[PDB]
């Protein structure tokens, strides 16, 4: 494990296209998606994570624990029901989102003090990298 605590900007972002393509976004949904840069904050205490993705248009956020499967209903993104489970590949936090879509998920993972996470359904993954904003 890592503490990948904390609060992040977006400082790159490769193929977000491919990755709401993957999830049928709509047209105009990707142009706006594409502009809205959230804001990623991570709380983590022990095995207890809430992740939230942040923009002036509406916030998402998970809360799990590592190990604990749980429904989510991506509310706000795909609208579409997984089961995700959160576990840590080494000091990677991998989620795998179990449903409809084929190999869905995401990984996490910090390099020194700079914060990644590959976004991946069906073979096209969107790659971010963070910096800690304060
Ligand atoms: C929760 C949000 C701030 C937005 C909400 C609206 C959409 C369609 C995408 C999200 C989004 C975004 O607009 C930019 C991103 O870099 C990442 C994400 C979260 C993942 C969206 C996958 C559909």
Not at 36 to 46: A, D, R, S, W, Y
């Amino acid at each position: 494990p890592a503490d990948l605590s904390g609060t992040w900007t977006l400082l790159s972002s490769d193929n977000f296209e491919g990755y709401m393509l993957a999830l049928g976004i709509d047209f105009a949904t990707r142009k706006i998606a594409k502009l809205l840069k959230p804001q990623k904050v991570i709380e983590q205490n022990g095995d207890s994570f809430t992740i939230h993705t942040n923009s002036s248009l509406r916030n998402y956020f998970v809360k799990f624990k590592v190990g604990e499967e749980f429904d989510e209903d991506n509310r706000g993104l795909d609208n579409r029901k997984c089961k995700s489970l959160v576990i840590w590949d080494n000091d990677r936090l991998t989620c795998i989102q179990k449903g409809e879509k084929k190999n869905r998920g995401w990984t996490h993972w910090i390099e020194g003090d700079k914060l990644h996470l590959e976004m991946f359904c069906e073979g096209q993954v969107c790659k971010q990298t963070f910096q800690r904003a304060l």
